[PDB]
From a paper:
Secretory (S) Immunoglobin (Ig) A is the predominant, mammalian mucosal antibody; it is a polymeric antibody assembled in plasma cells that link two IgA monomers and a single copy of the joining chain (JC) to form dimeric (d) IgA (and to a lesser extent, higher order polymers). The pIgR uses five Ig-like domains (D1-D5) and a cytoplasmic tail to bind and transcytose JC-containing antibodies to the apical surface of epithelial cells; there, the pIgR ectodomain, called secretory component (SC), is proteolytically cleaved, releasing the SC-dIgA complex into the mucosa where it is called SIgA. The IgA CH3 contains a C-terminal extension called the tailpiece (Tp), which along with the JC, is required for IgA dimerization and subsequent pIgR binding. Our work describes the structures of mouse SIgA and its precursor, dIgA, which lacks the SC.
We determined the CryoEM structure of mouse SIgA to a final average resolution of 3.3 Å. The refined structure revealed a pseudosymmetric assembly of two IgA monomers conjoined at the center by the JC and bound by SC. The FcAB and FcCD are bent and tilted with respect to each other, resulting in distinct concave and convex surfaces on the complex. To describe the conformation, we defined the angle between the centroid axes of FcAB and FcCD (97 degrees) as ‘bend’, and the angle between the two non-intersecting centroid planes of FcAB and FcCD (30 degrees) as ‘tilt’. SC asymmetrically contacts the same face of both FcAB and FcCD along what we define as the ‘front face’ of the molecule. The interface is dominated by the four heavy chain Tps (TpA, TpB, TpC, TpD) and the first half of the JC sequence, or, ‘core’ (JCcore), which together fold into a single β-sandwich-like domain at the center of the complex. The interface is further stabilized by the second half of the JC sequence, which folds into two beta-hairpin ‘wings’ (JCW1 and JCW2), each extending outward from the center of the complex and binding one CH3 from each IgA monomer. In contrast to unliganded SC, the SIgA structure reveals SC domains bound to dIgA in an elongated, open conformation contacting both antibodies and the JC asymmetrically on the front face of the complex. D1 contacts FcAB, FcCD and the JC, D2 protrudes away from other SC domains and the front face of the molecule, and D3 is clamped to D1, positioning D4 and D5 to contact FcCD and JCW1. The interface is dominated by residues in D5 CDR1, including Cys470, which disulfide bonds to CH2C Cys306, covalently linking SC to the antibody, as well as D5 CDR1 Lys471 and Tyr473, which form hydrogen bonding and hydrophobic interactions with CH2C.
Author numbering:
A (entry chain A), C (entry chain C), D (entry chain D): 237 to 467
B (entry chain B): 237 to 460
E (entry chain J): 3 to 93, 97 to 137
F (entry chain E): 2 to 496, 509 to 548
Write the structure that this text describes.
Amino acid sequence: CQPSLSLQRPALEDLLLGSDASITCTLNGLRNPEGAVFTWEPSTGKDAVQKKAVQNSCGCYSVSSVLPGCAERWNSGASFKCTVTHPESGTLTGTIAKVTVNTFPPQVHLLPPPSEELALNELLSLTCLVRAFNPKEVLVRWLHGNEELSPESYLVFEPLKEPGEGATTYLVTSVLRVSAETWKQGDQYSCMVGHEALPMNFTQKTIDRLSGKPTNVSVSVIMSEGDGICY
Amino acid sequence: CQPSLSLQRPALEDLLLGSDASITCTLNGLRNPEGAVFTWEPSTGKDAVQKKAVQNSCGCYSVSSVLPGCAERWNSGASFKCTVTHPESGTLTGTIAKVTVNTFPPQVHLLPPPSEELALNELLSLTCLVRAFNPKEVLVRWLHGNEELSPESYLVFEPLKEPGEGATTYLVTSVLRVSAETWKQGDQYSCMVGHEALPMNFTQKTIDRLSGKPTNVSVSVIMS
Amino acid sequence: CQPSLSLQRPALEDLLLGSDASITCTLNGLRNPEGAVFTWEPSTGKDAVQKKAVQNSCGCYSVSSVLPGCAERWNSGASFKCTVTHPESGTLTGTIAKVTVNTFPPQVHLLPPPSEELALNELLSLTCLVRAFNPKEVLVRWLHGNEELSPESYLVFEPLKEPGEGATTYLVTSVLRVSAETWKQGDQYSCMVGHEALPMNFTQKTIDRLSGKPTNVSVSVIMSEGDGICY
Amino acid sequence: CQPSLSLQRPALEDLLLGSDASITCTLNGLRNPEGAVFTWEPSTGKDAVQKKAVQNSCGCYSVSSVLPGCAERWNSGASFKCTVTHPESGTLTGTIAKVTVNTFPPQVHLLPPPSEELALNELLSLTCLVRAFNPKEVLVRWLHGNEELSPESYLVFEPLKEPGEGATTYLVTSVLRVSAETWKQGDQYSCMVGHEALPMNFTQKTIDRLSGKPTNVSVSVIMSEGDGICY
Amino acid sequence: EATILADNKCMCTRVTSRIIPSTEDPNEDIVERNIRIVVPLNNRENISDPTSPLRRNFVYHLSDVCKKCDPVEVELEDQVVTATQSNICNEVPETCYMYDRNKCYTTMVPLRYHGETKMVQAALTPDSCYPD
Amino acid sequence: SPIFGPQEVSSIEGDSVSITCYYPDTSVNRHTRKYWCRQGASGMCTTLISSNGYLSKEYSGRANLINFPENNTFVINIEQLTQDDTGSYKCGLGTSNRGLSFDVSLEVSQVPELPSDTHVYTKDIGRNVTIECPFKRENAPSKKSLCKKTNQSCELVIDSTEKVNPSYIGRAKLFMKGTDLTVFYVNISHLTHNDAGLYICQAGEGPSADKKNVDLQVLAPEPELLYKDLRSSVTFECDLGREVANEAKYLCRMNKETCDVIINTLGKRDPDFEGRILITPKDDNGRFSVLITGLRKEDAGHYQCGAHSSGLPQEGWPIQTWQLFVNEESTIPNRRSVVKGVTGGSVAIACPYNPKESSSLKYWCRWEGDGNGHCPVLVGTQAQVQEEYEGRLALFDQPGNGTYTVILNQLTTEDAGFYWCLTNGDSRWRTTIELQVAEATREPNLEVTPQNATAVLGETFTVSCHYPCKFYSQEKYWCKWSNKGCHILPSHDEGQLVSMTLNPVSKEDEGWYWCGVKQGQTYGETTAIYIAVEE
Ligand SMILES: *[C@@H]1O[C@H](CO)[C@@H](O[C@@H]2O[C@H](CO)[C@@H](O[C@@H]3O[C@H](CO[C@H]4O[C@H](CO)[C@@H](O)[C@H](O[C@H]5O[C@H](CO)[C@@H](O)[C@H](O)[C@@H]5O)[C@@H]4O)[C@@H](O)[C@H](O)[C@@H]3O)[C@H](O)[C@H]2NC(C)=O)[C@H](O)[C@H]1NC(C)=O
Ligand SMILES: *[C@@H]1O[C@H](CO)[C@@H](O[C@@H]2O[C@H](CO)[C@@H](O[C@@H]3O[C@H](CO)[C@@H](O)[C@H](O)[C@@H]3O)[C@H](O)[C@H]2NC(C)=O)[C@H](O)[C@H]1NC(C)=O
Ligand SMILES: *[C@@H]1O[C@H](CO)[C@@H](O[C@@H]2O[C@H](CO)[C@@H](O)[C@H](O)[C@H]2NC(C)=O)[C@H](O)[C@H]1NC(C)=O
Ligand SMILES: *[C@@H]1O[C@H](CO)[C@@H](O[C@@H]2O[C@H](CO)[C@@H](O)[C@H](O)[C@H]2NC(C)=O)[C@H](O)[C@H]1NC(C)=O
Ligand SMILES: *[C@@H]1O[C@H](CO)[C@@H](O)[C@H](O)[C@H]1NC(C)=O
Ligand SMILES: *[C@@H]1O[C@H](CO)[C@@H](O)[C@H](O)[C@H]1NC(C)=O
Ligand SMILES: *[C@@H]1O[C@H](CO)[C@@H](O)[C@H](O)[C@H]1NC(C)=O
Ligand SMILES: *[C@@H]1O[C@H](CO)[C@@H](O)[C@H](O)[C@H]1NC(C)=O
């Protein structure tokens, strides 16, 4: 219940899919009532809409302070410093610093369903393996070729650090259930990954019944005018 | 801090090479020190050993206890009742029992590595997709073709409910980074899943260079 | 002879290689002395020059009057005219303007020398087939490895209308004799064509021995199962 | 209109088809309408024939007379010295014969179509490059394998003197449009050429699709697990 | 060594040639031609639009390979005019079987955000499409 | 192929290494995936390090990968090396299945022995060393020799009694110091790879306890890598000591065997580089900065710089080697490389540079050639114009845009040659232009009407420049020439002349006025004319 200030990193979905990098300077762990004041260094005119104090079941309060319109600061890596004052916790500072020392882009791998689920013809399980990315926070969604699927239709697990000798990376796996009818009926299902280190922030992968060399491939090649004139 | 009794079921590690299991009781939300007694009903030659009590971030204590030697009893669906008495809340009691009313065994599905990682010659991500089971608690252990890999070596995620309707069927996943050299040499990398619903409490799946080989691809070259 | 008016559009070499559009207005068919007057509608300050009169057969005079309206003016599509007043009779008038209705660009086809001459070491005949273009006038030039040869070595033929049906087009086949030795040393002999429809008004085709017809060919097809990058 | 003598050479068509001769002695630039007389070296059998006269644009007139001579006197080089006489004009005498001092046979060269048109599958172009011949006159025709093709389906550019040194070598070109469909079936299209310095008075060459195709058209397919691509 | 005549990334194809002394006649020289084609197996009929089905046709014309659409300056002892090197370089984008690393191919994908839709673009080539 | 790096590297047991690998300048190759794989007997290149976050267990904590987009390269550091690390390695981008990569034959040695317990000397070639050989004080007034150990027998090579070896006459000498040292100091002014081996020094003719062996090894300098782009320039910096400053340097190229000389300080020059090569002045430190332009494939190879009285590669003298690799995938736009001008007309050459270093100094000289590789600046951002011109030459610094233009009117046959595009910038984009002159072929497209202009003070004067339709759609300008450049003059235009009126007239208005054109940003044909005023 002791004082504890922490700068919450803005939500990735609130940073890539949108354009408001709402930073929060949470002052959690207060046995006493509220009555504090917040202050920021990069005062760009946007007043910090201060939020109320929530009293968790444990019996302590937690205040918050929002900062809108700080997307340019995050993209540029400008550090964010928050200062809060309170009788029980006078001096308290928090620092934000975008990770730009050992960041890596995620590697997406949309795997096809197994061999048994195909024989059942009931439901298929598609997996989107996102690998290699130092920033833990990552965004993952699915689409029915061009229609986005609701989050309640698929699952997204929590990132976990990848073991082994080397740099620090994370890994996630999202599962999507699909009907065999739409699978055989040539319906493209894609996996969209949103990340900061990526170029344009997004990367897409698609798959269908023709996952790629599925033991049945009818290839053709026609090299016409092979002996013609090559200007 | 309001005292509340929370009963915990033994973990899946009891059916392992281990011998016995262990039921656990806990009283969270106490401001007074220890001194109570964790009495049980099925105390048949089982010592109700107690444990140290910890505190919360605001002073709420947490008592605990254990009951060793209840593996066969719980396996037979035997019911257990916990009983404790402390001043801050009088007497608190609870009951538990192995859940087997809606049991479903998992369905392992080993997926092959993607063709993209093959061009890198680095590690290959092998996935072991589990699905279809009510008890979210599941055991996952990889094998290097009859060799037990360390837990820190491979990776395992947490169970999550399925996005369907009809019943509660959780699912889990696990990724293993295999050296491309060993993968090409021909070494089986099996996936062992543990669950009380399965016969022998264990199911195994294997996968390495076994798949519809793409040797039937037809190429038609025409140099008109 | 009976007098008559004729408006001669500017040449091509004087329009593409040069940007003056000296549009001419000739008053031919006169069997009497000169002494006429020429007037133009687009009086852009450039005084129209009334050139002298020549004498054709059977003592038929012929007067001419040019107007350097520059290529830009004639290019914009402005309609020019020529009102002339002659002494032998009353007056006469004509009109002229650029055409861009059924205008098509040429389809150059630089054919290689025939095998009948390759067996020897004498000269090799290079043909530059120009096809499909409505504007009759066409320019044809050659280059021996960035060096323009004198026109006294080419063999350009007058355009002739195609025998097919539909649109109106013309064809020409410029020929150039090249030493077989130079053809073996690896020297280029390109063919350039100038036309109005052509964007940039110039097209080129260059052919050394290797672009021609080879003998022992070796094809190598590859089946890449990874990414679709050519590198 | 200045009266002047003129002798016309018989077209090579009749000479290379089964006709003795047919020289025409004309007196152009004639003034006043009135008959004339034409004498010459007595040929074998036929005498003289006076053809009808016409006028010109500005009023000039022209009287003509034909002499169905002999082909033997042509091959030998004998001359059909003409002589015109009529009032208002003097007695003009001219002489013409076969150029039997420097004659070269036409070096025909049949080229294939380009690789571009061969791929569009619409209409191909075939050129009959003819060169090496002192008399610019020449008879050109095409064949549909064996049938006589019409001149309304192809072009025949006017001959032109080559830029060589020494002899007066000429050159001609003839473009023929062919459908790619006939090409796919393996048809033929030859180029008939008739000249004076040609035994049998004819020479042709065909265009069966092979026309010396390249030898050893190799090919290889690579579909190994390891691409091993080079750069 | 061997001489290059065309290396088109759009429709990956490498057409090279060389002059080798004829083994049967040192005076004569043979003109050999080498071609390298890379037929993929995971690309689609359209590489910019992923809804199109897999491409198993692969038509390869030699006229489309050695195209050289890029212009070139010409000197005729007076002006340095510009000129094109092909008659089939028209401009709807043409079909490109394989990707070109230098180029950046993207696709439009709609997404939702707090009850609103947005047209975010995605990159198909992680290495490419970087702001630099 | 375009990837370049050390083809062969040699380290030692328990030592660190820092391998560098270049690649073309593109956003892809800078942000793509770097990798360092080892090639085995099966052909598959086993990956070991990558810029994505992979690190093999064998190199765990020993190596590390870094990507330098500014350098446009990527370095590979390694530590705790051993003998098992020997093998055929690679260094490229993307994946090993492609070709973008450069093979490496790293052969890590092991420390064999230190049999001679006192003094090892393993230095470079053509350098100077100080051979130390202590002994016993009792043996000072006696023998002071040094022999060469061999598998056959020992041979006296150096001695204080002038009993030396023929191969060391002049190339070495013994030096006896004072200060009561009791140690031998022998110099070897000239070293060669053959001089390596073992030597034995000893004092006293009798059996002394100072028969001390020596391990001499003559090495070659590590060839400095130079990854340059095609049609670019290069600066060979040959900085040696003051000992060879007063000597004649040179620059040769290693062929299949010996080194083919290309240029020296004696005026010699290879016809292949005639016009695209020179030598900078010699500073007090004897540093040379040879410059070359118009790089081509034939320029790639191993370059060597030395020094000798003859200015030619003689074995046994200082050496400085380089390894130049020309990248065919260059970013420099294909320039014409030749400019065919006509006497009396004018020329407009475009000198390029990196748009980021626009705030620098730019110059323009004429390649003398035969004398000694010169480059006398004729005009620059700060330099004025000489007296031989007094016009017919000026600069036009385009605000940014990458390049700047140079004008040269009143052309004549004496102006033909080679002109370079210098600038005080490390971009090294020095382009060489070959100026070809021809006789008066045709008339100029621009001709002023009043030739002998004789204006009057305080009286309006007018001058009109002809304006053919050839440049109807181009911009025009009149500018007064100065020793530093040409100042534009807002004149009057006509739809076909370019008028210029001076309502007032001052004696300062005299000088050389220019009539030129402009195609958006670049320039074209121009003409000059002198204007004088009467009284
Ligand atoms: C582009 O590539 C070049 C070549 O690799 C890079 O140059 C070196 O880069 C490394 C890694 O970034 C730097 O390492 C740092 O060096 C800091 C101090 O710099 C010293 O580096 C050398 C380390 O051994 C040292 O020898 C060197 O001494 C030289 O300069 C002195 C004057 O500065 C001079 O007195 C000496 O006689 C000698 O000539 C430098 O003092 C160090 O503090 C860091 O901890 C880190 O080790 C090198 O410094 C760079 N310079 C070198 C090796 O000379 C370059 O950085 C690359 N580009 C960019 C943007 O980094
Ligand atoms: C290694 O040491 C030798 C010895 O000093 C260096 O060469 C020596 O250079 C000096 C230069 O001062 C020469 O002596 C001078 O010669 C000039 C004539 O040019 C004379 O006028 C001076 O009075 C003075 O005597 C000396 O002869 C010369 N010796 C040899 C053997 O070349 C050499 O440069 C050194 N090398 C390195 C890499 O340091
Ligand atoms: C392949 O797909 C691409 C991307 O959709 C197509 O390019 C787009 O075409 C549509 C419809 O014509 C336009 O509205 C877009 O502006 C285009 N996007 C671009 C050019 O980036 C392309 O047309 C498709 N290929 C073919 C042959 O149709
Ligand atoms: C042997 O070599 C050393 C090292 O080169 C020489 O030392 C030089 O001495 C001169 C005169 O004192 C100095 O000017 C130089 O600067 C010294 N060398 C260096 C590298 O600084 C020495 O002179 C040579 N001769 C002897 C007899 O020792
Ligand atoms: C990626 O997200 C950042 C977050 O602010 C944004 O600035 C940037 O514009 C996004 N990328 C693109 C291509 O818009
Ligand atoms: C080609 O010339 C015509 C006639 O002057 C002009 O209309 C056209 O714009 C020119 N093409 C260009 C400038 O690309
Ligand atoms: C080249 O072609 C000739 C023609 O038949 C053949 O005999 C020879 O073997 C071929 N050589 C190669 C190397 O292809
Ligand atoms: C090339 O073709 C000739 C034709 O006779 C044949 O003899 C020879 O074996 C062929 N060589 C190859 C390598 O195909």
